[PDB]
Amino acid sequence: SAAKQLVDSTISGNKVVIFSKTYCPYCVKGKRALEKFLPKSKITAIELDGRNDGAAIQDYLLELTGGRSVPRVFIDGQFIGGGDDTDALARNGKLEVMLRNAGVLLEH
Template sequence: MVKQFVDAQIKNNKVVVFSKSYCPYCKMAKSALSDAGLKEYTLIEIENRDDCSDIQDYLLSLTGGRSVPRVFINGKFVGGGSELKSFQAKGKLVPMLKEAQAL
C-alpha cells in the first residue's frame, strides 16, 4: 500500500516533498521552493503517519536514501534540502520548476 501511495503522489503531482515538520533540512528544502516562488506543491509530513518508517524504507529503494526531505519534481527525484538550496543559489531551481509547469 505504501508503494502505491508514494508512487501515486510522485506521478500525480508536479512537485512532491516528503518531509518531517521539525527537520532542519526539510525546512531548508521548503524555503528553497518558497524562495523560487513556488506557492503550491504537495507536502507530505510523514512523522505522525503509522506508515512513516515504511514510507522511508520505500523512498530508500527509490532514491538510495531514507532520510527526508525527498523532493521530486516532475516525477524525478532531485534531492533533499542541501541540493534544493544549492539549485536555488545557482539559479537552477526556477527553470526546473518552470519546465515541470509548477511555476
C-alpha cells in the same frame, strides 16, 4: 505495498512533492526554497509526523531514490535530491530552471 503505492501515486499525481518531517533543518530549507518561487497550492508536502507508516515510506524512498532520510524532493515525478540539495539548487538558479521546464514557474 501500501507505501509504494502512496509514494508513487503522490509523485505521479503532483508536479512538486516533498517528503518531510518536523525535526529536519533541511526539510525547512527545502520547503522555503520551493515557496520562494511557488504558491503553496502548487507544493505537495507529505509530513511523516503522526503517521504509523513513516518507516515503510522511508524504506520505499530508499528503494526509489537511494536514501531513506527526509527531505526527498520530486519534480514531475522525478527525484531531484535530498537536503540540502534543494537549497543549493535554489541558490545557484537551477531550481528555477527545473520549475520552469516543469511548467509551474513562469518567466518573470
